[PDB]
């Protein structure tokens, strides 16, 4: 019976997984339309770093002690090289393996057993539905945070809050021995990761009309 509600939870979780994967596959074009990482890259095939915001910070550490600030920002993941832009499937395609092996250790033999089997399997089915929805909500919040961090770096760089990343490239001619050769040697290294600038005097204003 407890195993029965467990396998009902398994069936409900797999069923909602299949349903949500079909629904997500239905809207493939709009996801790539909205998550234009390939536009969001920078010119040296470099992922812009991740920033997080915060407004109206108050902490009561203990009695006789309050620390407040207006806003703050956090570097989450430092910028690095990238090769291909990431897609939404790296964050949203939840896994699915259908379990087709319910080994019924407790077969029904009475109608009361059939009825309690029905109601507890229903409870497991609903629990699997709730778990699948929670998993989806966690994933979409995560990828929303990623995109917001990228966009936050772009606009703080627009507002002159972070230095842009700096890359030195060194180019050398032919190389190698008489058996192995590479005809030119171009090496690029990023000598300056992006970071905040605490000198606020360089900041600039913003208006709308």
């Amino acid at each position: 019976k407890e195993t029965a509600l467990s396998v009902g939870a398994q069936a409900g979780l797999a069923w909602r997984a299949k349903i949500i994967d079909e629904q997500l596959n239905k809207q493939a074009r709009n996801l790539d339309a909205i998550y234009d990482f390939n536009s969001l890259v920078l010119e040296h095939n470099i992922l812009p770093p991740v920033l997080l915001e915060g407004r109206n910070t108050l902490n009561l550490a203990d009695a006789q002690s309050i620390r407040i600030s207006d806003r703050t920002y956090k570097v989450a993941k430092q910028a690095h090289f990238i090769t291909t832009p990431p897609t939404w499937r790296q964050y949203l395609w939840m896994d699915y393996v259908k379990p087709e092996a319910p080994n019924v250790t407790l077969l029904p033999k009475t109608k009361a057993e059939k009825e309690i089997w029905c109601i507890y399997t229903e409870r497991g089915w609903k629990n699997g539905i709730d778990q699948a929805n929670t998993i989806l909500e966690e994933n979409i919040a995560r990828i929303k945070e990623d995109f917001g961090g990228m966009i936050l770096y772009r606009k703080l760089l627009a507002m002159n809050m972070v230095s842009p990343p700096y890359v030195s490239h060194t180019d050398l001619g032919v190389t190698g021995d008489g058996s192995e050769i590479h005809i030119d040697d171009r090496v690029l290294r990023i000598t300056a990761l992006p970071e905040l600038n605490v000198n606020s005097a360089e900041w600039r204003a913003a208006v709308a009309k």
Partner: protein
């Protein structure tokens, strides 16, 4: 199953294209080679977009991908 129906019948499987060629000189729409172009959008299995399943079997119900992430939906729950 008979792909070249209402035609000349099957000639062979052009595996350069991976497609059947019928006795009629038209390209059959069935495939006959694994190395051939499909158009599929759905997949199976778990620990996907990761290193696949970890080769070792964990004593508990947890499963883990090779990059360290844990797939709770493939894993057995309480």
């Amino acid at each position: 199953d008979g792909c070249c129906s209402k035609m000349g019948g099957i000639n062979y499987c052009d595996s350069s294209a991976g497609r059947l060629v019928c006795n009629n000189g038209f390209y059959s729409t069935c495939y006959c080679t694994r190395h051939a172009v499909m158009d599929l959008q759905f997949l199976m299995g778990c620990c996907l977009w990761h290193g696949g399943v970890y080769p070792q079997l964990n004593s508990s119900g947890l499963v883990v991908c090779n990059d360290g992430y844990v797939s709770e939906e493939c894993s057995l729950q309480k």
